[PDB]
Amino acid sequence: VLTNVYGIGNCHIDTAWLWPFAETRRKIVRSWSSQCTLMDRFPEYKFVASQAQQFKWLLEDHPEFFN
Amino acid sequence: XXXXXXXXXXXXXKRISLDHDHVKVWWYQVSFSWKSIIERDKKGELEFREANINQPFGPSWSTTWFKVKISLPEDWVKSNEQLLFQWDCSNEGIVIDPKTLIPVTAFSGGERTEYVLPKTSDGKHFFYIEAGNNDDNRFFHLRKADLDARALYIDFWMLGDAARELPGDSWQKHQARQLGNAVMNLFDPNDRSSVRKCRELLQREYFDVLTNVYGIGNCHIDTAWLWPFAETRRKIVRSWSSQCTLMDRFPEYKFVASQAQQFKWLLEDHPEFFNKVLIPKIQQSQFFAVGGTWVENDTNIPSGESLARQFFFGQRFFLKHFGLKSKIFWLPDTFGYSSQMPQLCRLSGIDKFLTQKLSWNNINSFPHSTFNWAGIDGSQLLTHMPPGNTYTADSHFGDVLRTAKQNKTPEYYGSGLMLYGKGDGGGGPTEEMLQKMRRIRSMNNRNGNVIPKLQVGITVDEFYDDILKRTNQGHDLPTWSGELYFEFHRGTYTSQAQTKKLMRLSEIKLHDLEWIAAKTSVLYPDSYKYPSKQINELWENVLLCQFHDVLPGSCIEMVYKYEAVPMLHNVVKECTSLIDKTVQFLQSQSKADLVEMRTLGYDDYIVLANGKLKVIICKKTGVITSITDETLGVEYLDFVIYDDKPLGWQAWDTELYSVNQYKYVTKPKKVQVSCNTKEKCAVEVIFQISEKCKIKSVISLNATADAKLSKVDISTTVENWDARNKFLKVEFPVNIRNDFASYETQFGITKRPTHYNTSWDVAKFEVCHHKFADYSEYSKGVSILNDCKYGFSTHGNLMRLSLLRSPKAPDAHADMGTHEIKYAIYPHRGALSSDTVKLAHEFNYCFKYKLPKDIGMNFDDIISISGDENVILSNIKRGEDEQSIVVRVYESLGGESFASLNTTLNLKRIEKVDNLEMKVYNRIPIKLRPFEIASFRLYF
Amino acid sequence: XXXXXXXXXXXXXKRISLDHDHVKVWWYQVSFSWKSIIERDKKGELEFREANINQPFGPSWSTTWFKVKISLPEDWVKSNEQLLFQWDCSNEGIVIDPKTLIPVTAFSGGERTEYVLPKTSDGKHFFYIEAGNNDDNRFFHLRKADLDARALYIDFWMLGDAARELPGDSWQKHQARQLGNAVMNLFDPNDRSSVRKCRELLQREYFDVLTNVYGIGNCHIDTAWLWPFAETRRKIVRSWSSQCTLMDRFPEYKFVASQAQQFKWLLEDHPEFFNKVLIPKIQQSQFFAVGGTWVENDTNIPSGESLARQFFFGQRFFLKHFGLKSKIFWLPDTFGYSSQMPQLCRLSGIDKFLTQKLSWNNINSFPHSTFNWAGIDGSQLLTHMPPGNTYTADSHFGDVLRTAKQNKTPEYYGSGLMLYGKGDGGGGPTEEMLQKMRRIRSMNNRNGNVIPKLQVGITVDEFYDDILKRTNQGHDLPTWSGELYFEFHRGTYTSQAQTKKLMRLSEIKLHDLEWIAAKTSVLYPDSYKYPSKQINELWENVLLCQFHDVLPGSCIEMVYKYEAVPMLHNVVKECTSLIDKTVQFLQSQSKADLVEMRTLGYDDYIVLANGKLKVIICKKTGVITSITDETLGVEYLDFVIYDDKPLGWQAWDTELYSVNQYKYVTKPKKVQVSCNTKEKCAVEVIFQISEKCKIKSVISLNATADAKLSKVDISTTVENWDARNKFLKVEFPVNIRNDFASYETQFGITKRPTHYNTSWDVAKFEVCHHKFADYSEYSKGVSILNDCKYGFSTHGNLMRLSLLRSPKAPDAHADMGTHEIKYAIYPHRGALSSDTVKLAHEFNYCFKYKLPKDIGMNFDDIISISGDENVILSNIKRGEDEQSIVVRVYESLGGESFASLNTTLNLKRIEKVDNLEMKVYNRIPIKLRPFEIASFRLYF
């Protein structure tokens, strides 16, 4: 019986919620860093991002070494 | 949900072709052997005649032969087509295509079946087929063909069937539905090109936790049942032939045979070409003999000698060209199991056992199906137990995944267990499509080992190699002490005691002449003296009626008359002939010889006056009141009260009506006394009931120390009349409180409580026994000796013996006619606690006296220095080929005392030897373990 | 657990006595009336002969009479015993004990049944019984008796049966087990004194939340089914007699009758003594007429006139001595329900309705079984709905508590609903032991009101008094708009269109002459002019074949030939005779009269050239490509593509094979054209398929404004051959996106989506229709007119009409033979959106022309000042007794516009009158509500 069980680790972030945008702007950078340390620790991991603007938020806050 | 759309549509609805040849067809019937009819065929004009049509019949014991002479149609065109001839299966018969006669072909398989015509040789052959009647008319037509088209039809039928069994929540069910969809598309509009193509597309849709699912095709045959032995002797040859044609068609197939005598039956009937058939068949692979046992029987009723011969005389085939065997022991239809079986197995060189019934799935203080059996002897038995689905799970099985799920729950292991073939009938069939079954199951599940792999070709020998690895050797394991208990279907066990009376008397009688006939060895030398070849033939006929179905008396009326025929009778008649024979040239050293085997009053005041005890029946009541010991001080109130309750079930099980009052036999009795003497005292009291019938019991006993004995003898004589479907019993309430019931099983004494296990289902609780049953706190109790009745029950401490039973089964001989019954009631004491056991079992001895002319001295006690009261020697006999003799002993009283064994002999040597009469290098033990069978062998 | 011990024991196992009287018994058979055979009995020696034994037979349409002359045995002894005669029930017949002939007794009840002999009169009587053949041999023996002993046997049988139904967790199950125990005790050993005593002891063991459980014994009879009308006419008299003998035996019993014509059938056959039987029977109590309807029919296919007559002509019995009625409306076997029924019910003075199927239990946006039906008209209908167990729950019911639990779940109310009797057969039986049924159920449950009380004698009239109290008047209630949807079993609905072609043509034809025959009133006075007595007899014969089972064509082959017999035919033949009759003395005022009822090219370049539209079939493809409007701008790609898919189910339901490819009729076609003219254009294109068969459709239409019309006409002529079990359809894919499908129902237009409800089960989705179905976003769409086919389907917006169906049912006339089909495809626009509806329905009109001699002027338009295009007048007719005429109108377009009604007349007055033609004091409405039926009456 051919079957497959898979999954993709993902983070769904609301840009404005019971915590504000300026505060959650610091929250989105914590989502990227958890993957970076995971990459060296474990391979083949998959992450997805529903926000294209999420890139810009990281590029504005950390333009130098994180680009 | 389109559930009935896919499932019931295409399942109902060159390629298959039906041609009819009317001429050349002959029919034959005997209203009055295959070798005898071949000479009666070509000569002149005999009862063989033209049929060409369907032949109706009527009920008869006759068999109807049939001959079909077929000419191969055209040349090439219908040769590529699959040739087949369909027959309607009758009660019994055989099928042959003899030249002159080589072959024997299978018949007894189910009403649907296939007969393949050889495509190798182009020409004309003959067909010989007989049909047993009991009427069943045969439908016979020639069937041509294709193999690829019919394959898809079968594969699809087993597909949609597997779709229903699979869980609807799983995607597999929705998958198999879509698989049943696409197939139906091209299958519907009658296209040969589409069907053959769709079959390929379906295979593409097929192929795209360590466990194993296996099975072994087997046939369980009862040698005597509702069809007789002579007729079923023709039925067993149909079981072998079905395998032979299957071997060339499919490999890796496995067959097992519970009968070692089955070989002899085939060798006697077909000695010429079929003796050379078995050797490549058995030796290479695909065949295994389970247990190497001569008979499959109930082990409760007979002695260990019956279990001794079946192993030894079934091992005789090993001396011939034979002997690929298995360590499994198979008693599927056997009701109940002995507690000495774990001891008997290890000594017989057989380490595994199989049990169908007598188990439950729950926490019982017991884990699962698979079990390691530890007897009360202390020995262990590793046994393989099939699930609650028994042997009928894989029997005639096209359902695939159906019972696969129900098999996994009771069993843990690493793998499950499946038994293919039916165990109910003249013999079990083996289906020819099993090749596709293993293949199509390999179509659904992939290959390589990840998911459970499907292999039907593995042998139990390799299966027992897996259990030695995965599970631990073990200390704490599944543990059940003694026997097992589930619904017994006791039934005929206590019914028709007359066949027991004949057998039990024949049992001891055949067990009588055995050893002492080796004691005359010195007297007149030739081979010296022993009926080696003579007593061997004796055990041949006796074991035939001792089978599990035959012995209790559950069967049709025809073979039941064959039970009371010389088969049982002549054995006693031949043994009573030999006992009067061997005496002539032996006893001549005896002037007057008493021959016994061992090794060292008032009416109105209602009293029989003597010292030992007192037992009194009250006036006009008919019921015994006071049984009381003066020295002991125990007084009884509620004895020997006969009770009659009806029965509303068949022969198999026993089911009483809901809260039905059992009618007492108490009535306006009269008082009488048989004789007058100090030697002989019998007081007579009449009992009667509605639809007047005379129920008589007798009273016999010897006083004390003019008559001498410690035990009463009460024998019952009743001639049954009128009302049927009744069950008669006699009650002996002890009026005492005990949580334990002392009972002597086969070769020992098992310990069973007064109350059945809390997992028990059926209301009525009855126990099968050998001779006596007791209740002992060891300071006192009550002992009950009995004859011809193997049954009894525990009522809350009321002793109840079963006199007779009359089932509603289609047997008219289980209802009426006279019966002679015998039993006893014995006083118990701590000092006599070992005495009651000794005075119980062998009391069946019959006094016999005869004298010759006088020259000699008749007193010799030849036994050498043993003298153990706690031990009892059941059997000592000779060998097969030398004539070395064996000695088997077993300890009567065990569980407390460790018996020191000083047993030995003189002028020769001795070594310990197992139940198979095979040489074993521990030597003679100086001390015997509790509940241990000690068997030895004697050499010159 | 002693489960099979109590249940299966005593249930199987003066008092009942069987005596045999061989002599005096006579038998009779007709291989060629009860009043005709009584004169043929005593005279001479006729075919009446001595039987005295069992009489075998063979298949025939014949009936076999039987005569038993019985003399009462002894005097007193066997008089106290219950006298009984057991008969084996055949297909049909009657039983009589006539002197000379008073009685008529019941037969049609089940194979088991009882016939009581009167103990009041001591003497000798006669028995007349006939057996209908279709063979069934009768077993006839005289049976004497007691009543008390048999009562206990029945009560115990219904006891243990109730024990199994009761929850095992409850103590009641363990109680009833113990109740079944003590009874079996004294019952087993054959004691009459014990049985009669134990029966009393059992009653003592019996007697020691407001809810109600009731039921009404009823018989649902189909006037035409697999047995014919003439034969079932004898079957209906057996339904009445079973009640008559039950009334004296048991009181409070309730019976209901769905047929008002059932009264007339009995009054015609037994006018003398049985006209006086009904009056005390119906008037007092125990009898109720449901709906007062002349016929029980499917309401989808016919018009409202068929529903108008059945109410009115069924209310004619009320004018006789009759009229105890109920407010319930009963259509259990009717498939589907109209949306105008809530409007038709309130006007007919009937406030309740019953529906068997077409419901589900879940949250549907719907609570339960009990329902208040709100039609699309806005009116409300309170209806009583039986559970999912339908009417077969209480049918032949001895099981007591069995279905009592399953009845409580779908229904809330304060109480449940049970319908006693079978609705499948020649007629339903009513059991005579129902007296004990109500009593024994009062034995288990106590009396007084705490727990639910058991009363089978309550009437639905009082039941509707309970619903008015407990539940609120309501605003928000259970609500379902339009019709109901469950598995329809459409089946024969689209099958055998030939019986529809005859009926649908007879439908309009009988609906034709109705009103205009009252327009000649002034011309020649006698009664003036109208076929009052003549057209009344016309509707008598027509409604007979319009029943729910008969009309769709689901039936045996025998009565199917009676459908195409003059029964349907002569109606058209008599109406075409009258239309040529009344014209003679009428049309004589017309020189040349056009009679119609109302109130005010190329081949290779493949074109038929005109202004209105263009429809093109591609070359060699056979499939229409472009249907396109220039002004509108809608282009179509995928029209009129015939599709043939097989069918694997019976006549009842329709089940297609799993994913079976439907064969297209496309083939190497050739091109042709019928005629050449501007008036007439028909282009011919041939289609063929495997096993060659000629499938022909035609093309007809009128151009624009030389020919004038807005709509095409395409008629299909196909003669079926060879392959059966096929289902033919023609597809009209719109290539458009709409979530709504415009369809005109009976008296209005219902609104149904493109997708079936999410609770739908069966894959195939098809809808029954009257004439046309459309898809409209109101700016555009596609309209499809059709004839003789009531079925269609919604494929995802692909219009598919069903041409023919051939079921696998045992009917050989549903397979082969020619058929004439007709339909159409119409262009849709917002302005023509009201036009398409007007050009659809009544297009079935047939042009007819005839002329007499000339004196007069033939132009008169007599209609007075209405002129509403959104309204359509379906029926205007006269009355029964005066000869006042009624006018019924209904609004075609509704749900949006509120139609102002200016409709009135001159020289007379007018008042609003309901569908029952009963006088109603609101007056003529000046404005009509959307989807409202407006009916009025006209007086001099």
Numbering used by the authors:
A (entry chain A): 287 to 353
B (entry chain A), C (entry chain A): -12 to 0, 45 to 63, 77 to 178, 193 to 203, 209 to 271, 287 to 678, 702 to 739, 752 to 818, ...
Provide passages from the article that reported this PDB entry:
The earliest discovered selective autophagy pathway in Saccharomyces (S.) cerevisiae is the cytoplasm‐to‐vacuole targeting (Cvt) pathway, through which hydrolytic enzymes are sequestered into double‐membrane vesicles, termed Cvt vesicles, and transported to the vacuole 8, 9. The best‐characterized cargo component of the Cvt vesicle is the vacuolar aminopeptidase I (Ape1) 16. Ape1 is synthesized in the cytosol as a 55‐kDa zymogen that includes an N‐terminal propeptide (hereafter referred to as prApe1), which oligomerizes into a dodecamer 17, 18 and further assembles into larger aggregates in a propeptide‐dependent manner 19. In addition to prApe1, Atg19 also binds another cargo hydrolase α‐mannosidase 1 (Ams1) 25, 26 via a site distinct from the prApe1 binding site, thus forming the Cvt complex.
In order to further the structural analysis of the components in Cvt vesicles, we determined the 3D structure of the secondary cargo Ams1 from S. cerevisiae using cryo‐EM. The images revealed class average views with two perpendicular twofold rotation axes indicative of dihedral symmetry and were used for determination of an initial low‐resolution 3D model of Ams1. After vitrification of the sample, we refined the tetrameric Ams1 structure to 6.3 Å overall resolution from 33,588 particles (and EV3A). Subsequently, we built a complete pseudo‐atomic model based on a homology model of the mannosidase core combined with two additional N‐terminal domains. For the remaining N‐terminus, we built two domains: a jelly‐roll fold (residues 45–203) and a four‐helix bundle (residues 17–27, 209–271) based on distant homology and the EM density. In contrast to the homologous dimeric S. pyogenes α‐mannosidase 32, S. cerevisiae Ams1 forms a tetramer. The transverse interface connecting two monomers perpendicularly to the Ams1 length axis is formed by the β‐sandwich domain and is located on the opposite side of the dimerization interface described in the homologous mannosidase structure. In addition, we identified an N‐terminal four‐helix bundle domain that comprises the major longitudinal interface bridging two monomers along the Ams1 length axis within the tetramer. In analogy to the mApe1 structure, a putative Zn2+ ion is coordinated by central enzymatic residues of Ams1 His298, Asp300, Asp411, His626, and is located in the interior of the oligomeric assembly. The corresponding SDS–PAGE shows that wild‐type tetrameric Ams1 binds MBP‐Atg19 efficiently, whereas the introduction of a W234E mutation drastically reduces binding. This suggests that the Ams1 wild‐type tetramer is required for in vitro recognition by the autophagy receptor Atg19.
